[PDB]
Amino acid sequence: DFPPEFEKFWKTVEMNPQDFTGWVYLLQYVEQENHLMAARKAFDKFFVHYPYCYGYWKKYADLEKRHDNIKQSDEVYRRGLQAIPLSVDLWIHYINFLKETLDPGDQETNTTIRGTFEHAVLAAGTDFRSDKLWEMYINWENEQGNLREVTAVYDRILGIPTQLYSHHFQRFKEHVQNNLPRDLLTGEQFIQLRRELASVNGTDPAKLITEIENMRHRIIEIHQEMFNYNEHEVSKRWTFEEGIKRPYFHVKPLEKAQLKNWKEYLEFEIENGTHERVVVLFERCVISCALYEEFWIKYAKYMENHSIEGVRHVFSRACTVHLPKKPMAHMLWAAFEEQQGNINEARIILRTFEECVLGLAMVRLRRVSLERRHGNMEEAEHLLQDAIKNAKSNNESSFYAIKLARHLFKIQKNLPKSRKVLLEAIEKDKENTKLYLNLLEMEYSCDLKQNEENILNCFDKAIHGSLPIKMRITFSQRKVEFLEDFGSDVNKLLNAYDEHQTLLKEQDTL
Amino acid sequence: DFPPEFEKFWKTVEMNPQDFTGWVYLLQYVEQENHLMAARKAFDKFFVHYPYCYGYWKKYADLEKRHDNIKQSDEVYRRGLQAIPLSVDLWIHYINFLKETLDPGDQETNTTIRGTFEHAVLAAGTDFRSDKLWEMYINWENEQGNLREVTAVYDRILGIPTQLYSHHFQRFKEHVQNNLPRDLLTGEQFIQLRRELASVNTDPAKLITEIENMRHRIIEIHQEMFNYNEHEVSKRWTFEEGIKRPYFHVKPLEKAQLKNWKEYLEFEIENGTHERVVVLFERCVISCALYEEFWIKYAKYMENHSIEGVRHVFSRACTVHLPKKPMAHMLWAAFEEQQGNINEARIILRTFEECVLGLAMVRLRRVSLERRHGNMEEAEHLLQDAIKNAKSNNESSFYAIKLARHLFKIQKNLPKSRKVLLEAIEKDKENTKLYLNLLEMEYSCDLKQNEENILNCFDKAIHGSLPIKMRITFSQRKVEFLEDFGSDVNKLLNAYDEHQTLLKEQDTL
């Protein structure tokens, strides 16, 4: 059981999965109809293709909720996060979702929420726009009253840059001001502080007030230093980060200006920031502007430098998912696979690609070139055989035949078979010069003896062709140039000049 | 002692011997000054270069006469005729000259005149415009009264076509009518005729009857022969009248008349006698001597008749009329080789290059000959001197490429071809053809020693510091190569990176 027009929309994506617009139409459709299993099939396939679009994840989950089948909605949020673990907004949606649906009667709820917030920060807290997440964490651990944890959170976050670091600092200052220092720390963290005071100095209520106020100012001094440090590290990156205008993925193409922005900012962190900080920012630059292979490629280069098979994973997410058509990505990936030693996987990369996008230059060329370099020459031949077999354009099949002839003759010798291949190609085309040029270069390459007469056969068949061409006259030129350079007996040169002049005359007649 | 401005005119010819106009001016000058030795030097050299102009022969001879040095004028007429023996007008001038200056008191004069007329006809009487010559002969032997010889003359000419055949026939008819048949023939020629009369079958009326019958029978004979010759005329009338300039002149001919000469030649080739052809062919050489095509077809025809006259024609072609026009010398050296006399063809080539300061076809054919006959040292040295003297950097590059091809493919020694190519590069650096030919060479060997050698060539191409699209095309072809044949992908990828880098740097500029 399905809604009526469903098939129609689906056929569109059945046609071209990259018709994002086709999706958008299908998804508004399935919402307005509110048929579950259809929407599930849809969203599942779509999110396989375009995961980094969180808003549709949220809408998917809100649908499953609308059908009061919550455990599915939890699976949806978790799946989306499994795909994209840096959409601050998505973690926020998951957390607010848990708040909506959890039984405080159970003790474990708060435990799950704690683990969830820790997961969220450990996955995406490093984002320069992850503030409302930290603030949510803070207010959470505050209402629970567990202000020790609140202080731990503030300690963690202030060692990280954000857009609104100053807001967090003023909140921490207010938090210290309006609460009791015994509550804040872990006894030890407290007690040592007290002892430190004593080294400077060398029951009573008012004296206790003095000590508490002094504790406050000392902690303020500590965190003010740390904040100055983080603010400097921010001001380094402020211009860059503000340069971004779209930290979220979207189909619309980016201006080259922001492309330079992402690239130069990436390079900046590469030189100075932590390797961890880099990987974070790099995955971000993958989330936005995922469409552009260039960035994934520079990512692969960086992951090369760190001597990790993550490059492997990276290429998959590039080719397997976002940009399957753009070829240079798959090319570079197969190149890396070859470089390491896992091999047949590269063959399968190529077979899958060509199976998808109907054969291309770089494709068949690289496939043959690898099967060549590793010595399974039979398959290398058969690729070009099938290529000419299935080639669509006569000039295309001619090109494939030229490449086959060159490889076969220069690599596997067997010059006669290259000749026969060329002549097959001729009978197919007859009219394209490149075939004759390659055959002549070939025969000339052999000694001027076995191919002495053969070169003349080639030249004669070129010039005596069915339809006379100005190119045939160029062939007359080159036959004469040959014979004048090297000739057995002048008689041949003289009859050749006769043919040349005769062709000049007939050319002028027509 | 010489006329003043002489040197100037002479330098023009000293400069450009073919400046016909320069001659014409020089000759009006030297005449108007009337200094002998100058005119002799002039006319002699000029006629060496442009003989076929008879009018200047006549003027030369008239000058020598004007200086009352007649023996020289006879030498001049004989010189011109030995050079050109089909100018009817010139023989006519020579004969009228003899009439003007000869002492009839001597008997030998008429003998010389007789021999001269016979020579004239035997050289040029066959011309379709040789009428006034025959008529002059006739009136000559008529005033002398020896009408038997006149009858012989008429017999000869009426077996030949002319523009005015009808004029000759009516003259023959009047000649028979107004003279005595006893006188006309040699008794023998007479008696046989008489005998024929009897086979059909003193008194004055009987004698008159026989004389009139003999006359009418002779007319019958010659009328038949004349009908035959008139047919042979009407075949060639349109052709011969098609000519508008039977005399040589520098001005170039319209292509229409060129076709006329061609097909008329072809006609006589098919029907006329070989001798009858050769006469007309020499005619077609006399006018339009400038056009190598006709001399060439002449040599081709003389091929069929198996005579070294071909040789003669080529000399007269190359040595004289068109020394610069190259296809003539090319074909002549080719024919010389074709016979077996060889070094003469080499000298043909050397003379040409000495004349016109070196050209492609020249060095190409010269080297190819020295090649085919095995003096490979000279074959190298030709291209060596070619590089020595080449004017344009591209010219020396081209000659060097030809040297490399010859040296490697023919004389083996691939290393010397490599070093020669690099010499050519260091000289030029910028010419693409050099790199392409070197690449084809190295590619021809196995993909191994020239794996690295090709890498050196391609590397110099790409790193050549040439801000050119061509450097990028060379990157393209290095990539195409490596994709076609590659040791390890690392090089292909580094090449792809360099290629992209150059794409970007080019786009910046």
Short mmCIF file of N, CA and C in Angstrom, two decimals, chain A residues 250-387:
data_model
loop_
_atom_site.label_atom_id
_atom_site.label_comp_id
_atom_site.label_asym_id
_atom_site.label_seq_id
_atom_site.Cartn_x
_atom_site.Cartn_y
_atom_site.Cartn_z
N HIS A 250 25.20 22.23 1.29
CA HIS A 250 24.07 22.61 0.45
C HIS A 250 24.49 22.43 -1.00
N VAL A 251 23.53 22.05 -1.83
CA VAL A 251 23.82 21.72 -3.23
C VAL A 251 24.38 22.93 -3.96
N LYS A 252 23.89 24.13 -3.65
CA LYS A 252 24.27 25.33 -4.36
C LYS A 252 25.79 25.45 -4.40
N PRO A 253 26.37 25.83 -5.54
CA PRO A 253 27.83 25.85 -5.66
C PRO A 253 28.44 27.06 -4.98
N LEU A 254 29.68 26.89 -4.54
CA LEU A 254 30.36 27.93 -3.77
C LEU A 254 31.15 28.86 -4.67
N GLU A 255 31.27 30.11 -4.22
CA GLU A 255 32.15 31.08 -4.86
C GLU A 255 33.61 30.69 -4.64
N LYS A 256 34.45 30.99 -5.63
CA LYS A 256 35.87 30.67 -5.50
C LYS A 256 36.51 31.37 -4.31
N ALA A 257 35.97 32.54 -3.92
CA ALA A 257 36.51 33.26 -2.77
C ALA A 257 36.49 32.39 -1.52
N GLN A 258 35.33 31.82 -1.20
CA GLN A 258 35.23 30.96 -0.03
C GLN A 258 36.03 29.68 -0.21
N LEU A 259 36.23 29.24 -1.45
CA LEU A 259 37.10 28.10 -1.69
C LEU A 259 38.53 28.42 -1.26
N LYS A 260 39.04 29.59 -1.66
CA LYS A 260 40.32 30.07 -1.16
C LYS A 260 40.30 30.18 0.36
N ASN A 261 39.18 30.64 0.92
CA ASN A 261 39.06 30.78 2.37
C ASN A 261 39.28 29.44 3.06
N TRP A 262 38.47 28.44 2.70
CA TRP A 262 38.62 27.10 3.27
C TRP A 262 40.04 26.57 3.06
N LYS A 263 40.59 26.72 1.85
CA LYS A 263 41.90 26.15 1.56
C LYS A 263 42.98 26.79 2.44
N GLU A 264 43.04 28.13 2.46
CA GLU A 264 44.09 28.82 3.21
C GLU A 264 43.93 28.61 4.71
N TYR A 265 42.68 28.59 5.20
CA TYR A 265 42.43 28.31 6.61
C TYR A 265 42.88 26.90 6.98
N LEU A 266 42.56 25.94 6.11
CA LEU A 266 43.03 24.58 6.25
C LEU A 266 44.56 24.54 6.36
N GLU A 267 45.25 25.19 5.42
CA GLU A 267 46.71 25.23 5.44
C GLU A 267 47.23 25.85 6.74
N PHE A 268 46.57 26.92 7.19
CA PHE A 268 46.94 27.59 8.44
C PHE A 268 46.95 26.58 9.58
N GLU A 269 45.82 25.91 9.80
CA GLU A 269 45.78 24.92 10.88
C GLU A 269 46.81 23.81 10.65
N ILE A 270 47.03 23.42 9.40
CA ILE A 270 48.02 22.38 9.11
C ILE A 270 49.39 22.77 9.65
N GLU A 271 49.76 24.05 9.53
CA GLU A 271 51.10 24.42 10.00
C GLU A 271 51.17 24.55 11.52
N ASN A 272 50.15 25.12 12.16
CA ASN A 272 50.22 25.47 13.58
C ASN A 272 49.35 24.62 14.49
N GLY A 273 48.06 24.48 14.20
CA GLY A 273 47.15 23.78 15.09
C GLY A 273 47.55 22.33 15.30
N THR A 274 46.87 21.70 16.24
CA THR A 274 47.16 20.30 16.52
C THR A 274 46.72 19.43 15.35
N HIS A 275 47.36 18.27 15.21
CA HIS A 275 46.90 17.29 14.23
C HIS A 275 45.42 16.99 14.43
N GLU A 276 44.99 16.87 15.69
CA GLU A 276 43.58 16.67 16.01
C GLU A 276 42.75 17.84 15.51
N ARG A 277 43.19 19.06 15.84
CA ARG A 277 42.50 20.27 15.40
C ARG A 277 42.39 20.31 13.88
N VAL A 278 43.46 19.90 13.19
CA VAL A 278 43.42 19.84 11.73
C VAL A 278 42.33 18.88 11.29
N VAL A 279 42.44 17.60 11.68
CA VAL A 279 41.47 16.60 11.24
C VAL A 279 40.04 17.09 11.46
N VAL A 280 39.79 17.76 12.59
CA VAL A 280 38.47 18.33 12.85
C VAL A 280 38.10 19.33 11.76
N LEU A 281 38.96 20.33 11.55
CA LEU A 281 38.66 21.37 10.56
C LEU A 281 38.54 20.79 9.16
N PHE A 282 39.33 19.76 8.87
CA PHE A 282 39.33 19.16 7.54
C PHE A 282 38.02 18.43 7.30
N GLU A 283 37.57 17.64 8.28
CA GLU A 283 36.26 17.01 8.15
C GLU A 283 35.15 18.05 8.02
N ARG A 284 35.30 19.20 8.69
CA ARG A 284 34.35 20.29 8.49
C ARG A 284 34.35 20.74 7.03
N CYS A 285 35.54 21.05 6.50
CA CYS A 285 35.66 21.48 5.11
C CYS A 285 35.17 20.41 4.15
N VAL A 286 35.13 19.16 4.60
CA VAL A 286 34.49 18.12 3.81
C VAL A 286 32.97 18.24 3.91
N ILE A 287 32.43 18.62 5.07
CA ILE A 287 30.98 18.64 5.24
C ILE A 287 30.35 19.72 4.37
N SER A 288 30.72 20.98 4.60
CA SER A 288 30.49 21.98 3.57
C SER A 288 31.39 21.67 2.38
N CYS A 289 31.05 22.21 1.22
CA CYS A 289 31.80 22.02 -0.03
C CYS A 289 32.28 20.58 -0.18
N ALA A 290 31.37 19.63 0.08
CA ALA A 290 31.68 18.22 -0.15
C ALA A 290 31.71 17.88 -1.62
N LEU A 291 31.06 18.70 -2.44
CA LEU A 291 30.91 18.41 -3.86
C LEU A 291 32.24 18.51 -4.61
N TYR A 292 33.17 19.33 -4.11
CA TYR A 292 34.38 19.66 -4.84
C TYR A 292 35.48 18.66 -4.50
N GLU A 293 35.87 17.84 -5.49
CA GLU A 293 36.84 16.77 -5.27
C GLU A 293 38.17 17.30 -4.75
N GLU A 294 38.51 18.54 -5.11
CA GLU A 294 39.79 19.14 -4.77
C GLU A 294 40.09 19.01 -3.28
N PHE A 295 39.08 19.30 -2.46
CA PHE A 295 39.29 19.34 -1.02
C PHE A 295 39.49 17.94 -0.46
N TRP A 296 38.65 16.99 -0.87
CA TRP A 296 38.85 15.60 -0.47
C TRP A 296 40.25 15.12 -0.86
N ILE A 297 40.73 15.57 -2.02
CA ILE A 297 42.06 15.16 -2.49
C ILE A 297 43.15 15.71 -1.57
N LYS A 298 43.09 17.02 -1.28
CA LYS A 298 44.08 17.58 -0.35
C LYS A 298 44.00 16.89 1.01
N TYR A 299 42.79 16.48 1.40
CA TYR A 299 42.61 15.68 2.61
C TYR A 299 43.37 14.37 2.51
N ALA A 300 43.22 13.68 1.38
CA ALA A 300 43.95 12.43 1.16
C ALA A 300 45.45 12.66 1.26
N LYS A 301 45.94 13.79 0.75
CA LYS A 301 47.37 14.10 0.85
C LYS A 301 47.80 14.25 2.31
N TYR A 302 47.01 14.99 3.08
CA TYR A 302 47.36 15.17 4.49
C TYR A 302 47.36 13.83 5.20
N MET A 303 46.31 13.03 5.00
CA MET A 303 46.25 11.71 5.62
C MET A 303 47.36 10.79 5.13
N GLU A 304 47.88 11.02 3.91
CA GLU A 304 49.12 10.38 3.49
C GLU A 304 50.24 10.70 4.46
N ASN A 305 50.42 11.99 4.75
CA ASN A 305 51.55 12.40 5.59
C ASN A 305 51.54 11.71 6.95
N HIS A 306 50.35 11.38 7.47
CA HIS A 306 50.23 10.76 8.78
C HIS A 306 50.28 9.24 8.73
N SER A 307 50.59 8.65 7.57
CA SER A 307 50.87 7.22 7.46
C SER A 307 49.74 6.40 8.06
N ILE A 308 48.53 6.62 7.53
CA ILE A 308 47.33 5.97 8.02
C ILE A 308 46.51 5.48 6.83
N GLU A 309 45.90 4.30 6.99
CA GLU A 309 44.97 3.77 6.00
C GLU A 309 43.65 4.52 5.99
N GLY A 310 43.52 5.55 6.83
CA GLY A 310 42.35 6.40 6.77
C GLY A 310 42.14 7.02 5.41
N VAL A 311 43.24 7.31 4.69
CA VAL A 311 43.21 7.75 3.30
C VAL A 311 42.21 6.87 2.57
N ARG A 312 42.39 5.56 2.73
CA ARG A 312 41.50 4.54 2.18
C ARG A 312 40.06 4.93 2.46
N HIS A 313 39.69 4.93 3.74
CA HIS A 313 38.35 5.33 4.14
C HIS A 313 37.96 6.63 3.46
N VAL A 314 38.86 7.62 3.49
CA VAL A 314 38.55 8.94 2.94
C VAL A 314 38.10 8.80 1.50
N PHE A 315 38.91 8.13 0.67
CA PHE A 315 38.57 8.01 -0.74
C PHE A 315 37.20 7.38 -0.91
N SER A 316 36.88 6.36 -0.11
CA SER A 316 35.56 5.75 -0.21
C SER A 316 34.49 6.81 -0.02
N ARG A 317 34.51 7.50 1.12
CA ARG A 317 33.49 8.52 1.37
C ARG A 317 33.45 9.54 0.24
N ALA A 318 34.60 9.81 -0.38
CA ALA A 318 34.61 10.70 -1.54
C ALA A 318 33.90 10.05 -2.72
N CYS A 319 34.41 8.90 -3.16
CA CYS A 319 33.95 8.28 -4.40
C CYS A 319 32.68 7.46 -4.19
N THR A 320 32.65 6.64 -3.14
CA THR A 320 31.51 5.76 -2.89
C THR A 320 30.22 6.54 -2.72
N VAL A 321 30.31 7.81 -2.34
CA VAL A 321 29.16 8.52 -1.79
C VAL A 321 28.88 9.81 -2.55
N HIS A 322 29.74 10.81 -2.38
CA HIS A 322 29.39 12.18 -2.75
C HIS A 322 29.56 12.45 -4.24
N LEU A 323 30.73 12.15 -4.79
CA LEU A 323 31.07 12.45 -6.19
C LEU A 323 31.49 11.20 -6.93
N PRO A 324 30.56 10.29 -7.22
CA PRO A 324 30.90 9.08 -7.96
C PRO A 324 31.25 9.34 -9.42
N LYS A 325 30.69 10.40 -10.02
CA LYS A 325 30.89 10.65 -11.44
C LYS A 325 32.24 11.31 -11.71
N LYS A 326 32.57 12.36 -10.95
CA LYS A 326 33.84 13.07 -11.12
C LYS A 326 35.00 12.09 -11.07
N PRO A 327 35.73 11.92 -12.17
CA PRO A 327 36.61 10.75 -12.31
C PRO A 327 37.95 10.87 -11.60
N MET A 328 38.59 12.04 -11.68
CA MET A 328 39.93 12.21 -11.13
C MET A 328 40.03 11.70 -9.69
N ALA A 329 38.93 11.80 -8.93
CA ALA A 329 38.90 11.25 -7.58
C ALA A 329 39.15 9.74 -7.61
N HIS A 330 38.33 9.01 -8.36
CA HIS A 330 38.49 7.56 -8.45
C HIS A 330 39.86 7.20 -9.00
N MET A 331 40.35 7.98 -9.98
CA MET A 331 41.69 7.76 -10.53
C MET A 331 42.75 7.81 -9.44
N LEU A 332 42.77 8.91 -8.68
CA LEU A 332 43.75 9.07 -7.61
C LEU A 332 43.61 7.96 -6.57
N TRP A 333 42.37 7.56 -6.28
CA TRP A 333 42.15 6.51 -5.28
C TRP A 333 42.75 5.19 -5.75
N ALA A 334 42.43 4.77 -6.98
CA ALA A 334 43.03 3.56 -7.54
C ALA A 334 44.55 3.66 -7.56
N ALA A 335 45.08 4.86 -7.84
CA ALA A 335 46.53 5.06 -7.81
C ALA A 335 47.09 4.76 -6.42
N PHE A 336 46.43 5.28 -5.38
CA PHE A 336 46.88 5.02 -4.01
C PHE A 336 46.81 3.53 -3.67
N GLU A 337 45.68 2.90 -4.03
CA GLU A 337 45.52 1.46 -3.81
C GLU A 337 46.66 0.68 -4.43
N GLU A 338 46.97 0.97 -5.70
CA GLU A 338 48.14 0.36 -6.34
C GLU A 338 49.41 0.65 -5.55
N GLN A 339 49.58 1.89 -5.10
CA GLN A 339 50.80 2.28 -4.41
C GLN A 339 51.04 1.45 -3.15
N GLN A 340 49.96 1.07 -2.46
CA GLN A 340 50.13 0.31 -1.22
C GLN A 340 50.38 -1.18 -1.47
N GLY A 341 49.59 -1.82 -2.32
CA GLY A 341 49.76 -3.25 -2.52
C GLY A 341 48.46 -4.02 -2.64
N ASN A 342 47.39 -3.53 -2.02
CA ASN A 342 46.07 -4.06 -2.31
C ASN A 342 45.71 -3.67 -3.74
N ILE A 343 45.45 -4.66 -4.60
CA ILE A 343 45.51 -4.43 -6.04
C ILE A 343 44.15 -4.63 -6.71
N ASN A 344 43.64 -5.87 -6.69
CA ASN A 344 42.39 -6.18 -7.38
C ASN A 344 41.27 -5.22 -7.00
N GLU A 345 41.34 -4.65 -5.79
CA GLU A 345 40.40 -3.60 -5.41
C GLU A 345 40.43 -2.44 -6.39
N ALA A 346 41.62 -2.06 -6.88
CA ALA A 346 41.71 -0.99 -7.87
C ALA A 346 41.03 -1.39 -9.17
N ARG A 347 41.26 -2.63 -9.62
CA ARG A 347 40.52 -3.17 -10.75
C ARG A 347 39.02 -3.01 -10.54
N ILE A 348 38.54 -3.31 -9.33
CA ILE A 348 37.10 -3.26 -9.06
C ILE A 348 36.61 -1.82 -9.03
N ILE A 349 37.43 -0.90 -8.51
CA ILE A 349 37.14 0.53 -8.62
C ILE A 349 36.87 0.89 -10.07
N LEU A 350 37.77 0.48 -10.96
CA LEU A 350 37.66 0.85 -12.37
C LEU A 350 36.45 0.18 -13.02
N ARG A 351 36.26 -1.12 -12.77
CA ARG A 351 35.11 -1.83 -13.33
C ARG A 351 33.80 -1.18 -12.89
N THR A 352 33.68 -0.85 -11.60
CA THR A 352 32.48 -0.20 -11.10
C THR A 352 32.27 1.16 -11.76
N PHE A 353 33.32 1.97 -11.82
CA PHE A 353 33.21 3.29 -12.44
C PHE A 353 32.74 3.16 -13.89
N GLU A 354 33.48 2.39 -14.69
CA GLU A 354 33.14 2.26 -16.11
C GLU A 354 31.73 1.69 -16.29
N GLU A 355 31.37 0.70 -15.46
CA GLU A 355 30.00 0.20 -15.41
C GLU A 355 29.00 1.31 -15.15
N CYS A 356 29.40 2.33 -14.40
CA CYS A 356 28.48 3.40 -14.04
C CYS A 356 28.37 4.47 -15.13
N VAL A 357 29.50 4.90 -15.70
CA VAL A 357 29.55 6.12 -16.50
C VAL A 357 30.04 5.84 -17.92
N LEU A 358 29.76 4.63 -18.43
CA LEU A 358 29.72 4.36 -19.87
C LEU A 358 31.08 4.54 -20.55
N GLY A 359 32.18 4.29 -19.84
CA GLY A 359 33.48 4.26 -20.48
C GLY A 359 34.03 5.64 -20.76
N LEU A 360 35.33 5.84 -20.52
CA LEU A 360 35.96 7.14 -20.76
C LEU A 360 37.42 6.92 -21.11
N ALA A 361 38.07 7.99 -21.55
CA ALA A 361 39.48 7.94 -21.92
C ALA A 361 40.31 7.48 -20.73
N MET A 362 40.47 8.37 -19.74
CA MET A 362 41.28 8.08 -18.56
C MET A 362 40.96 6.71 -17.99
N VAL A 363 39.70 6.29 -18.07
CA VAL A 363 39.21 5.05 -17.47
C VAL A 363 39.90 3.85 -18.11
N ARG A 364 39.57 3.60 -19.38
CA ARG A 364 40.14 2.45 -20.08
C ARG A 364 41.65 2.54 -20.15
N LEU A 365 42.18 3.76 -20.33
CA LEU A 365 43.63 3.93 -20.40
C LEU A 365 44.30 3.47 -19.11
N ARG A 366 43.79 3.91 -17.96
CA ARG A 366 44.40 3.53 -16.69
C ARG A 366 44.22 2.05 -16.40
N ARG A 367 43.04 1.51 -16.72
CA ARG A 367 42.77 0.09 -16.51
C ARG A 367 43.78 -0.76 -17.28
N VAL A 368 43.93 -0.47 -18.58
CA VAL A 368 44.90 -1.19 -19.40
C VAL A 368 46.31 -0.96 -18.87
N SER A 369 46.63 0.29 -18.49
CA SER A 369 47.99 0.61 -18.08
C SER A 369 48.41 -0.17 -16.85
N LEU A 370 47.50 -0.32 -15.88
CA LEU A 370 47.84 -1.12 -14.71
C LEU A 370 47.95 -2.60 -15.06
N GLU A 371 46.93 -3.15 -15.74
CA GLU A 371 47.03 -4.56 -16.12
C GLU A 371 48.30 -4.84 -16.92
N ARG A 372 48.78 -3.84 -17.66
CA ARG A 372 50.08 -3.90 -18.32
C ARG A 372 51.22 -3.96 -17.31
N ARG A 373 51.33 -2.92 -16.47
CA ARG A 373 52.50 -2.77 -15.60
C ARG A 373 52.72 -3.99 -14.71
N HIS A 374 51.65 -4.71 -14.38
CA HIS A 374 51.76 -5.87 -13.50
C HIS A 374 51.75 -7.19 -14.26
N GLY A 375 51.73 -7.16 -15.59
CA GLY A 375 52.14 -8.28 -16.40
C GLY A 375 51.04 -9.21 -16.86
N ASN A 376 49.78 -8.94 -16.53
CA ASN A 376 48.67 -9.74 -17.06
C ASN A 376 48.24 -9.15 -18.41
N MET A 377 49.17 -9.24 -19.37
CA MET A 377 49.01 -8.60 -20.67
C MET A 377 47.79 -9.11 -21.43
N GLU A 378 47.38 -10.36 -21.20
CA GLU A 378 46.22 -10.90 -21.90
C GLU A 378 44.98 -10.06 -21.62
N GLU A 379 44.72 -9.78 -20.34
CA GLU A 379 43.59 -8.92 -19.98
C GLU A 379 43.77 -7.52 -20.54
N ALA A 380 45.02 -7.02 -20.57
CA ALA A 380 45.28 -5.70 -21.13
C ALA A 380 44.87 -5.65 -22.60
N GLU A 381 45.21 -6.68 -23.37
CA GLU A 381 44.73 -6.78 -24.75
C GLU A 381 43.21 -6.83 -24.79
N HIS A 382 42.60 -7.70 -23.98
CA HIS A 382 41.16 -7.92 -24.08
C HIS A 382 40.37 -6.65 -23.76
N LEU A 383 40.90 -5.79 -22.89
CA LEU A 383 40.24 -4.51 -22.64
C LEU A 383 40.10 -3.72 -23.93
N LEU A 384 41.20 -3.56 -24.68
CA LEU A 384 41.15 -2.80 -25.93
C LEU A 384 40.34 -3.51 -27.00
N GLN A 385 40.38 -4.84 -27.02
CA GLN A 385 39.52 -5.61 -27.92
C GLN A 385 38.05 -5.28 -27.69
N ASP A 386 37.59 -5.42 -26.44
CA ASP A 386 36.22 -5.05 -26.11
C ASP A 386 35.96 -3.57 -26.40
N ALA A 387 36.97 -2.73 -26.20
CA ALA A 387 36.82 -1.29 -26.42
C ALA A 387 36.48 -1.00 -27.88
#
